[PDB]
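INPUT
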Amino acid sequence: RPRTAFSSEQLARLKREFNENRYLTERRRQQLSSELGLNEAQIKIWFQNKRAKIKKS
Amino acid sequence: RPRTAFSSEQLARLKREFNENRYLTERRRQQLSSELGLNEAQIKIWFQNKRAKIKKS
DNA sequence: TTTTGCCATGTAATTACCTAA
DNA sequence: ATTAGGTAATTACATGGCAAA
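OUTPUT
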């Protein structure tokens, strides 16, 4: 498998972004893409996965 | 998956099951497929659809 | 000390089912 | 029928620190 590695500066805006808003919109899902230069699908699962550990944690 | 059509022999067995419980279970999806000769995934979607309809009331 | 030799974690990805159009 | 994005459960794997000769 190709396990993506996140940049210390990506994990940051993601996190910052989850705080303010834990549910991604398409617009928002899009913009993040541009900016972080990540694909709308990984930002997708990230948020899913965040919410997940928060629940189990 | 090709649009299909249920026999009345099947359609009425689906409706009798959907009467006992609206949620299918894996083993039971199985059981009905070998029974009614349908394809699991067809059974699965009938149910979804039915639930969604019944809801509307 | 050092070097080797394992594990246990965290997490990213993935699956199977959900309601709703 | 299909489709997207949600939850819950996983599985794969890249890692750090620990144990021991």
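end of record. Chains A and B do not touch (no CB pair under 8 Å).
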